[PDB]
């Protein structure tokens with residue numbers, strides 16, 4: 001089950017009853033770089049994992065899901081301070097959408113001249129929205145200093161974010177902000193904490209499984 005905006009620009013694919021992936025194309029010189037997050041359909045509103053590349057996409061994304069599920073976006077979890085995750089933080093703040101992050105992610109956002117998310121997430125934080133349970137986990141440095149994962153214990157679904165490379169990624173990508181000697185250890189910390197995983201969402205590329213974590217480990221060798 002897959003739904004595109006008017007344009008190609010934005011797509012949502014259904015994973016299960018109350019969980020979808022959101023994907024948006026960012027436009028870079030000779031063109032399209034897609035980015036993924038999650039949409040959680042809860043009894044108390046829509047909760048997103050991550051925003052998008054910029055404000056224009058972020059608005060359009062909110063407006064699509066609010067229309068479709070007939071409820072407001074109330075909360076977003078920002079999983080690190082690069083533009084594909086936090087690009088639409090301005091839109092979030094101005095609409096009264098709570099933007100959750102670790103304090104490190106918030107510090108880095110401010111350092112890079114983005115508006116500040118909440119800095120409310122700890123190394124392990126458990127949230128509940130309606131009946132929907134969500135855990136955030138800081139496994140250590142990898143793709144960036146601050147990168148976190150998100151876990152839906154009710155579905156054993158892991159949002160890997162940009163810590164986790166898709167099967168189509170044949171290299172680590174941009175590592176300016178990365179910690180390639182700790183990234184393996186951070187991935188291992190994810191595998192140790194979540195020992196039975198039903199689906200893994202990478203920050204870019206196709207949805208997979210535990211094999212994506214092993215793919216990323218191979219990529220680090």
Ligand SMILES: [K+]
Pocket residue numbers: 154
């Ligand atoms: K339950």
Ligand SMILES: [Zn+2]
Pocket residue numbers: 080082143144162
């Ligand atoms: Zn990133």
Ligand SMILES: [Zn+2]
Pocket residue numbers: 035082084085162203204
């Ligand atoms: Zn990314």
